[PDB]
Amino acid sequence: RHFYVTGPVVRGAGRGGKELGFPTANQYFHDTVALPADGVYAGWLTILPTEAPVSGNMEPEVAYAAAISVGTNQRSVESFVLDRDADLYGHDVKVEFVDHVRAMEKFDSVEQLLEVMAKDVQKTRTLLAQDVQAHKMAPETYFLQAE
Ligand SMILES: Nc1ncnc2c1ncn2[C@@H]1O[C@H](COP(=O)(O)OP(=O)(O)O)[C@@H](O)[C@H]1O
Numbered sequence: 001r002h003f004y005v006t007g008p009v010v011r012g013a014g015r016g017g018k019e020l021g022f023p024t025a026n027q028y029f030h031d032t033v034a035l036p037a038d039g040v041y042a043g044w045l046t047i048l049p050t051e052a053p054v055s056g057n058m059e060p061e062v063a064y065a066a067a068i069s070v071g072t073n074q075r076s077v078e079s080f081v082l083d084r085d086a087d088l089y090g091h092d093v094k095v096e097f098v099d100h101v102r103a104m105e106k107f108d109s110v111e112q113l114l115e116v117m118a119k120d121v122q123k124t125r126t127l128l129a130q131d132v133q134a135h136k137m138a139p140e141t142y143f144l145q146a147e
């Protein structure tokens, strides 16, 4: 299908995310793990098969639409799962990269950063819908809202 990485969702600085309305599931990787260049990507986040209870509105083995930010400190992957809310900490998750949204950019203010994040989300919805429409998949296996 798509390029992907897996690993546990871990603690970041725990500020600048949830309290601004854009919580992101942090994963970290040694830079010898293949990843795309720093930037924002449209993709799917799946909680891998597990006996662990998940708290909130995501179930294991379902691909949730995500806006994924890749950074370099060693490498980081930070996924905002669209229109969902669950405690992902400690869960083993797969992040699939579908399409490129934009290169890394710098921002004037917190407010400008949030404006761009909202644009990244809207572009993520459209790119994923275009990838759902071609390459047809079963309704039960993915989650994506148009609005
Ligand atoms: N829609 C969502 N997308 C990503 N993570 C979410 C979402 N809703 C709740 N979470 C939880 O919020 C956490 C991220 O919040 P954040 O404020 O970015 O803190 P941190 O710095 O620890 O990454 C995730 O690890 C996950 O447990």
Ligand SMILES: [Ca+2]
Pocket: 012, 017, 023, 024, 025, 026, 078
């Ligand atoms: Ca985060």
